[PDB]
UniProtKB/TrEMBL annotation:
The gene is CcCel6C. Disulfide bonds join 91-152, 286-336. PROSITE patterns: GLYCOSYL_HYDROL_F6_1. Substrate binds at residues 49, 183, 186, 225, 285, 316, 320. Its EC number is 3.2.1.-. GO terms for biological process: cellulose catabolic process. This is Glucanase. GO terms for molecular function: hydrolase activity, hydrolyzing O-glycosyl compounds. Keywords: Carbohydrate metabolism, Cellulose degradation, Glycosidase, Hydrolase, Polysaccharide degradation, Signal. InterPro entries: Beta_cellobiohydrolase, Beta_cellobiohydrolase_sf, Glyco_hydro_6_CS. PANTHER family: GLUCANASE (PTHR34876:SF10), PTHR34876. Belongs to the glycosyl hydrolase family 6.
């Protein structure tokens, strides 16, 4: 069943707290409407990312807070998590912050990292909650389009085996899993559709060699990207790609999932999708200037308009930088100085207040104020 129906995805307190800076900024500008819209954003659920082992320490406090909230509110709390730590992570990038490396026991270390997450998701408090978990952004798409890259060649089996173990390890009645499936501009090209469906099924099949009746709910798309759910002005760079918005990505990928027997249910990130015409190339991803908050999290079919979409969600938390634009930074990524990037920007994950100011102003539909 669609786990989002009737459920209240969890507001991430640590994220809502960061927005106090944005509220203070608008108040200091004499801008009560945008201050109030930012207050609305504080109440919008986002995903909590587990992108390293240290972050596992945040999970039990998050769960305890979630249970307290469930008791107080009478809601059916749905905790949204991202697992993002495969060994030799981000194999096609020039650099990665992933902490595990295949040549330093990374496969076993990844299993133990998953085991630590499982432990946290196995407490009596965890049992009271429901979870929606996105598995490993920037992973399997590389086996479709980046197999000319030495690091991807060396990591392909490990990505499939890693994700298989994660799936097999999180088979509980209160957990729904969505495997990351990139975005239309990556895997939506005609040549990529069938191989993508095949690798998702292959990975699920591997999971079932570990835990016999293992399942997933489906796929997560547009994670940390900006693609509109429904475009109002198709971009020139989408020429010859039928997945020119994410609703069309769902429509075009679905038949291939069905053909291979992989579940064709999707959650779609729209956290930074409010404004179009902000990029000159589809491949631009880092702190794209003038991005706006998009469609708010919802299961409403009047908006979603697809039996294959479980929900629109906000996976990447807007305001957390994609990377630094400082040319002299140790982790400088040239993508973060693209012609479309917002500069200066702080290190990946650090608060980028100027960017959130713009996410509020450029939100579509406009944010309703909470006065
Ligand atoms: Mg490192």
């Amino acid at each position: 069943v669609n786990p989002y129906i009737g459920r209240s995805p969890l507001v991430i307190k640590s994220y809502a707290e960061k927005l106090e800076e944005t509220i203070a900024y608008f108040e200091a500008q004499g801008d009560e409407l945008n201050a109030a819209r930012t207050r609305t954003v504080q109440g919008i659920p986002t995903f909590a990312w587990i992108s390293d082992s240290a972050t596992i320490d945040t999970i039990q406090p998050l769960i305890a807070d979630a249970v307290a909230h469930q008791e107080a509110s009478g809601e059916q709390v749905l905790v949204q998590l991202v697992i993002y730590n495969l060994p030799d992570r981000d194999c096609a990038a020039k650099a990665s912050d992933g902490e595990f490396h295949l040549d330093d026991d990374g496969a076993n270390k990844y299993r133990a990292y998953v085991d630590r997450i499982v432990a946290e998701l196995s407490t009596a408090d965890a049992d009271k909650l429901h979870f929606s978990i996105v598995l490993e952004p920037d992973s399997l798409g590389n086996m479709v389009t980046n197999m000319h890259v030495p690091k991807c060649q060396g990591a392909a089996t490990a990505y499939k085996e890693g994700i298989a173990y994660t799936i097999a390890s999180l088979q509980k009645p209160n957990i729904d899993l969505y495997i990351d499936a990139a975005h239309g501009g990556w895997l939506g090209w005609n040549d990529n559709l069938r191989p993508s469906a095949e690798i998702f099924k292959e990975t699920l099949d591997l999971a079932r060699q570990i835990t016999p009746n293992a399942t997933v709910r489906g796929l997560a798309i547009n994670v940390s990207n900006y693609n509109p759910y429904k475009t109002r002005a198709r971009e020139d760079y989408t020429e010859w790609n039928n997945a020119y918005d994410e609703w069309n990505y769902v429509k075009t990928l679905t038949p291939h999932l069905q053909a291979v027997g992989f579940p064709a249910q999707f959650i779609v990130d729209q956290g930074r999708s409010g404004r179009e015409g902000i990029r000159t190339e589809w491949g631009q991803w880092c702190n794209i200037r003038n991005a706006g908050f998009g469609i708010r999290p919802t299961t409403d079919q009047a908006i979603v308009d697809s039996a294959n979409v479980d929900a629109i969600v906000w996976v990447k938390p807007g305001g957390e930088s994609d990377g630094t634009s400082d040319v002299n930074a140790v982790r400088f990524d040239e993508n973060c100085r693209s012609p479309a990037s917002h500069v200066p920007a702080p290190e990946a994950g650090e608060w980028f207040n100027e960017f959130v100011v713009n996410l509020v102003i450029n939100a579509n539909p406009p944010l309703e104020p909470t006065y």
